Every structure is written in structure tokens, then in C-alpha cells.
UniProtKB/Swiss-Prot annotation:
Description of how the protein assembles with itself and partners: Forms a functional homodimer and may form a heterodimer with PMT6. Interacts with RCR1.
MF terms in GO: dolichyl-phosphate-mannose-protein mannosyltransferase activity; identical protein binding
Residues exposed to the Cytoplasmic side: 9-218
Compartments where located: Endoplasmic reticulum membrane
GO cellular component terms listed in the entry, alphabetical order: dolichyl-phosphate-mannose-protein mannosyltransferase Pmt4p homodimer complex; endoplasmic reticulum; endoplasmic reticulum membrane
Extra remark beyond the main annotation: Present with 1270 molecules/cell in log phase SD medium.
Keyword Zinc: no
Function summary: Protein O-mannosyltransferase involved in O-glycosylation which is essential for cell wall rigidity. Forms a homodimeric complex to transfer mannose from Dol-P-mannose to Ser or Thr residues on proteins. Specifically acts on secretory proteins with an ER-luminally oriented Ser/Thr-rich region flanked by a membrane anchor such as FUS1, AXL2, GAS1, KEX2, MID2, WSC1, WSC2, OPY2, PRM5, RAX2, or YNL176.
Assigned keywords, A-Z: Endoplasmic reticulum, Glycoprotein, Glycosyltransferase, Membrane, Repeat, Transferase, Transmembrane, Transmembrane helix
Protein name: Dolichyl-phosphate-mannose--protein mannosyltransferase 4
Length: 218
């Protein structure tokens, strides 16, 4: 009666899941690592000198992010993430929160830098800047369940109203290990701002078992 989902099947994404997030047009994962942005770029613009966030096209521990609810929520396990709810993303390998802010990005002076911040900063003065949403492409899908692989979204920053974006026409220089740049795109409706959740790394037994649906005969 019971079957086990293959890796490639969709599952509901719940709060406290550890997920990877894949960009539709480039197949890159949202990635972070210890390296920091250069203090000053070649054109003289200054960065935040914060932790880099990049796009990386191979499986890696540094692609893993824990999905968290906002402060003051009373959420336990088994609670699905819904489209357009405010969420936070904690980078598992470094224990830092995803953050965007109105600082010019590495290659695009008019797009925003994406970084991560410490727990103390992110749960204190910088909290509002750690809020994102899995924004549905159509507004009527607000409140629908987020599922892996099959549900498109924009990774939307609440405080500055940008959508996280990446590209593979040109890559970061050696300081960014020739990974894809990530930045916050002010042109929210560009279809190149579309992502999915690729994997739920800490999937529980409740969600690995399913009963196959029956195809109706013609």
C-alpha cells in the first residue's frame, strides 16, 4: 500500500525545514560561504564588506538554509509554509540570517547587495531586513502551500521590495570563486526572478511515505 517518494517528487515545505533554493533560468542554488565582499570594488564603490551570497550550480552543504517564521510566532513542526507569508532564511553552514539592503550590489550599481548577518544583529536592530516571502507569481495564490520543485515563486525582500536575482552571462571574479552573482532586482516582474525549492534535506518519515494516486481508465 505505502510507497516511498523518490528524490525527484514534490513534498510540502514546513517551517524549520532545511531546504535548497534553485533559480529557474540558471539552475543555480542560493549559496553562501565564509568569504566576504571586497571592501571596495574596482570602480571605487564600497560594499558592506559582509558575507557573500552567490549562485552555485552543484550540490553542496553551503546551499542549505533553514526556513524560519517571524518573531513572536508560536510555530512547531508540521506547519506548512504558505506563499506570501513572511519568512526568514538561516544559512546552516555559517549560522547567519539572509539579509538584503539598499547598498549597491557587486556588479549592478542600481540593484541591491544580498548578504547574511549574525544572529545578534539579525534578531535585533537588523531584524526587519531579514524578512522575506516566497511571493507567488499570481497574487491569488497567496496563502497556498509551498511545495518543493513544483511551486514557482520570487524570493522577495519585504523591507526594500526587491526580488532576488542571478545570472550566468558573466560570473564573479576570483574573490567570488567564479560563482554567480546574486543581487536584489528592483524589476520584480522579470521572469528571471523565478525560483523553486529544490530539496528538503531534513524530510521526516511522515512526508517520505505516500499512497499512489490511481489513474482513471479511459
Amino acid at each position: 500500500h505505502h510507497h516511498h517518494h523518490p528524490m525527484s517528487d514534490s513534498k510540502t515545505v514546513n517551517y524549520f525545514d532545511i531546504i535548497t533554493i534553485k533559480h529557474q533560468d540558471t539552475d543555480a542554488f542560493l549559496h553562501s560561504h565564509l568569504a566576504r565582499y571586497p571592501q571596495r570594488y574596482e570602480d571605487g564603490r564600497i560594499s558592506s564588506a559582509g558575507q557573500q551570497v552567490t549562485g552555485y550550480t552543484h550540490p553542496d552543504f553551503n546551499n542549505q538554509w533553514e526556513v524560519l517564521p517571524p518573531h513572536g510566532s508560536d510555530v512547531g513542526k508540521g506547519q506548512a509554509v504558505l506563499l506570501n507569508q513572511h519568512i526568514r532564511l538561516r544559512h546552516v553552514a555559517t549560522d547567519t540570517y539572509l539579509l538584503a539592503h539598499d547598498v549597491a550590489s557587486p556588479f549592478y550599481p542600481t540593484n541591491e547587495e544580498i548578504t547574511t548577518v549574525t544572529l545578534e544583529e539579525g534578531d535585533g536592530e537588523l531584524y526587519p531586513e531579514t524578512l522575506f516571502a516566497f511571493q507567488p507569481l499570481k497574487k491569488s495564490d497567496e496563502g497556498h502551500v509551498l511545495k518543493s520543485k513544483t511551486v514557482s515563486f520570487r524570493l522577495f525582500h519585504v523591507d526594500t521590495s526587491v526580488a532576488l536575482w542571478t545570472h550566468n552571462d558573466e560570473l564573479l571574479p576570483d574573490w567570488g570563486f567564479q560563482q554567480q552573482e546574486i543581487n536584489g532586482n528592483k524589476k520584480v516582474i522579470d521572469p528571471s526572478n523565478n525560483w523553486v525549492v529544490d530539496e528538503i534535506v531534513n524530510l521526516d518519515e511522515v512526508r517520505k511515505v505516500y499512497i499512489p494516486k490511481v489513474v482513471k481508465p479511459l
